[PDB]
Design a binder for this molecule. Structure first.
Ligand SMILES: Nc1ncnc2c1ncn2[C@@H]1O[C@H](COP(=O)(O)OP(=O)(O)O)[C@@H](O)[C@H]1O
Ligand SMILES: Nc1ncnc2c1ncn2[C@@H]1O[C@H](COP(=O)(O)OP(=O)(O)O)[C@@H](O)[C@H]1O
Ligand SMILES: Nc1ncnc2c1ncn2[C@@H]1O[C@H](COP(=O)(O)OP(=O)(O)O)[C@@H](O)[C@H]1O
Ligand code: BEF
Ligand code: BEF
Ligand code: BEF
Ligand SMILES: [Mg+2]
Ligand SMILES: [Mg+2]
Ligand SMILES: [Mg+2]
Lengths: 372, 372, 372
């Protein structure tokens, strides 16, 4: 087959499509949903498991399980359904033709990458495949060969410093604070204004609140004082069922978890200090070009004001001698997939696939030598 | 001063009394009752609206309104009647003398705590007051500095991990399943044997069936098989009017809702998995002491067999390499009030009251900085 | 006078006790711990900051800060707590009466030794003190007067050639590779089996995995091939909370960092080439007697098999004409402290103390002329 698929099966929201396109062919929630009520209508297409946009649409009668937790596949029985849906339902291409570029977060369990390779060769029969790292693909989308990626998906936030083509694996920082945990924190603080959301169906409404209204404050303490001179920062959101909810300092006190992880009680650097600590693990001659080439990526980097709050805080930690030149491109909602759509299309990369003939003499253990 | 009041105004049943006593001075249903019928006997001590034990006694002619719903006050014009009845009709002390310890569930709406504080300083003029969390009070009655409190009242079930006197707010759980919804579910399943209860007056009779006859099965399917070798589990309850109702397996299929919330259709973990999911959100080194000091509280944990059913299920979820122990003292029906009666008595606590002299220069917003 | 203290203020784990005793009186983690959660249990011995074994025990609610980083005191406001705790809590002796032998790594910053001297004379008022080198103390514990000391603690690894009483400061080596960076790497490889240790308390669990289960392979690639006949090398450890983790090639691939620092991405010789380079920088006639008397020291030299891997590697680098006889004594967990407990006892050492009556006519600058 001439064309590769690239299939960023990432947490919360899969991206999939052919290499050499400039955007994903399909994007849908990485959700398998199962009925939670007594079926009664005989004579109907009643179905035992919905997946993707079917599960997102019918959700008022479903329990929703994401099969991926913090970038690790935790429910293979349902992860086969998400890949099966991805290839047979709306890409609608037989995997026996197209080789496929998958993608993984850095510092994942080796057992995940093995079992992921096995399913692709033994349930889908793809002629060849590869497992690039979510950060390394982002520099191809930016057109760079040096930078520090901050990638922050639904399930994981991570940094991978890269200089003039080489990744620095001792300086990789992985943090499990991401777009999911902000959604659970928003379900928690909305309780203190009197709105209760608790079902896995209602968590999707709280995700739509988070996406439509949140922003990152340029200076959180001054913003908290500004919300006490109240009603200038408040917004209304219109729930399904048409009840409005009004939302105030909890509009920006949600994304500030990224800069102050003690709000969700976990002990870590915020995303500003984790990027700065990663730059400070790099060899001293490269740091000037890492500060000049700091690259945002992944859906959590879409909030209004996050490029400014990030630049403000790295500029406070770094010496005033030199300039942080953060790049937040407008496509960064999909830049990992766009990166894989370049990588799978390179003429030099066609040597690097794991092929069916190279797998079956080596088993799923092959993936650790030929990949990152 | 000789005394302070402590006043657990919780859902379904207020507990009230002076600090330093070893049990509540007054206990009554948190009910306001309004005549639903044509008055005819002119020249009588007739009354516009009853409350507490008056309403509970005269209930056959009253629509009964509980002014607290799921731990949130939702009828302030009648909640002032419950506090007024508490302080003037059977504690019978002028509130202007005594500072008062109120009480609240965790994750309650901030608007509740504000308006509750305002009523206390502006309608009753109390010298000082405070609003402790129902879980934090529960450990003082047990004397422990560490444990996971499970508390389950009429209106709310919640868990609060506490270690070495520090609470973990990121690991708190709240579930809107409690002694009310088990009474509403018991009304429903009794329909299937032939008994119909529908009025807010009759619901108090179903609450007596629940309190007098229910228990938690140690192994639910084995107990359901035991009800097919029938008539060994049946009990007969004598209603007001003297009609007898035999109650069969619904005697234990009611309380089992706590361990399977899908019976009342709500999507959540039961109270066993909610306890274990709270412990699994705590920092790893404390979990051994939380498994050793699981503390029960609130009237819904009074059922026969619930300490054993809980110990069995937590011992199946937790790793078998360590002992799980659950402490369920015999006075746990009042341990939240007993805890407040200790907390208000401490010589080191007398700095922490919100005093009238601090409220009238900061407004009801004061309560969020001095309380939890 | 019966005593002088010897107080090896080392990184990771302070050793302290009176001179002439044969092992440290007190040994505890060099840690200050600060609460990271909301305090609720009023009426308790609730302490603003814990230190040593208190902090190590209560760690599940603390952020743990080691004040000593790579052998440098980086946080004086907390290092004074560790020395105050060391002298007043379990040595429990008035510092105003006992002279104290402190200790330092070779090639430390002068500002470290100055401020360390000032605190002892101006906060604790000690009558006299001295600052020996961690390596120069180690020869007294073995009883040598010639031998290249290799010492490897929590924070620093260094070599100090000594011959017939004289040190060779042009041939001293110091490397920021030690028991800390082995632990920080063990978290980063345990991650690839799926165990997500990340908090400053969970690093203490990973340190126990390191101390309990690690060993140094005699032939690394051959041991990595032996891991393909799997489960023969695996061991399992039971965490706090009772979960069991199995650990495999990541059991010995951790300590191999000492012999291949390129694993953690720094560029240097491994500790075998650091010894052979340090001997090869000595004057040619002493080398035969240095190879014959290589002396090991400090907790990171405790691993099973490290003496054999070292003797193998020096015997490959050094000419086959002569024997290497690496003397690793069995108490080398404490040889730096034991060496000081000899040094402070000698009748010929008592002329060399820096004394309170000499410090206040020269300032902290005295310590650069009267010590090494
Ligand atoms: N406009 C937006 N603003 C902020 N967050 C967004 C926005 N659009 C989507 N998100 C969040 O992005 C997350 C998905 O990010 P994504 O990059 O697709 O994750 P992943 O890389 O792991 O596949 C979800 O939590 C979602 O709510
Ligand atoms: N002996 C009992 N056995 C079973 N249930 C009880 C018992 N006593 C009270 N309850 C139930 O517990 C609830 C009252 O619990 P309570 O602790 O007073 O609630 P709250 O903490 O919110 O004030 C009611 O639903 C009541 O029927
Ligand atoms: N038995 C052991 N096996 C392996 N590592 C050990 C052992 N005992 C101590 N360590 C490690 O050695 C370090 C402490 O060594 P120590 O000699 O006390 O350091 P220092 O000289 O700087 O004071 C810690 O990283 C600890 O985990
Ligand atoms: F899986 Be996404 F990268 F968090
Ligand atoms: F208000 Be009770 F605690 F349910
Ligand atoms: F401070 Be120890 F010597 F690393
Ligand atoms: Mg991603
Ligand atoms: Mg209660
Ligand atoms: Mg040392």
């Amino acid at each position: 087959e001439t064309t590769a698929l690239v299939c960023d099966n990432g947490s919360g929201l899969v991206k999939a499509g052919f290499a050499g396109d400039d955007a994903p062919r399909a994007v849908f929630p990485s959700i398998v949903g199962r009925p939670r009520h007594q079926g009664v209508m005989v004579g109907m297409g009643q179905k035992d498991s919905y997946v993707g946009d079917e599960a997102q649409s019918k959700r008022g009668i479903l329990t929703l399980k994401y099969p991926i937790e913090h970038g690790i596949i935790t429910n293979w029985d349902d992860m086969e359904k998400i890949w099966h849906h991805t290839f047979y339902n709306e890409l609608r291409v037989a995997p026996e033709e197209h080789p496929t570029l998958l993608t993984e977060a850095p510092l994942n369990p080796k057992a995940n990458r093995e079992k992921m390779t096995q399913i692709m060769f033994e349930t889908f029969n793809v002629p060849a495949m590869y497992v690039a790292i979510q950060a390394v693909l982002s520099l191809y989308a930016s057109g760079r060969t040096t930078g520090i990626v901050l990638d922050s998906g639904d399930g994981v936030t991570h940094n991978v410093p890269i200089y003039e083509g080489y990744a620095l694996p001792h300086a990789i920082m992985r943090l499990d604070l991401a777009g999911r945990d902000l959604t659970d924190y928003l379900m928690k603080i909305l309780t203190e204004r009197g709105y209760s959301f608790v079902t896995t169906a209602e968590r999707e409404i709280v995700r739509d609140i988070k996406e439509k209204l949140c922003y990152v404050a340029l200076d959180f303490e001054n913003e908290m004082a500004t919300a006490a001179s109240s009603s200038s920062l408040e917004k209304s959101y219109e729930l399904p069922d048409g009840q409005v909810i009004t939302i105030g300092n909890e509009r920006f006190r949600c994304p500030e978890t990224l800069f102050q992880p003690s709000f969700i009680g976990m002990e870590s650097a915020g995303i500003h200090e984790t990027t700065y600590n990663s730059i400070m693990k790099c060899d001293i001659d490269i740091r000037k070009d890492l500060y000049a080439n700091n690259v945002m990526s992944g859906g959590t980097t879409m909030y209004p004001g996050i490029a400014d709050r990030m630049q403000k805080e790295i500029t406070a930690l770094a010496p005033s001698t030199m300039k942080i030149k953060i790049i937040a491109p407008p496509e960064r909602k999909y830049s990992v997939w766009i990166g894989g759509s370049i990588l799978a299309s390179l003429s030099t990369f066609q040597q690097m696939w794991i092929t069916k003939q190279e797998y079956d003499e080596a088993g799923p253990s092959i993936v650790h030598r030929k990949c990152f």
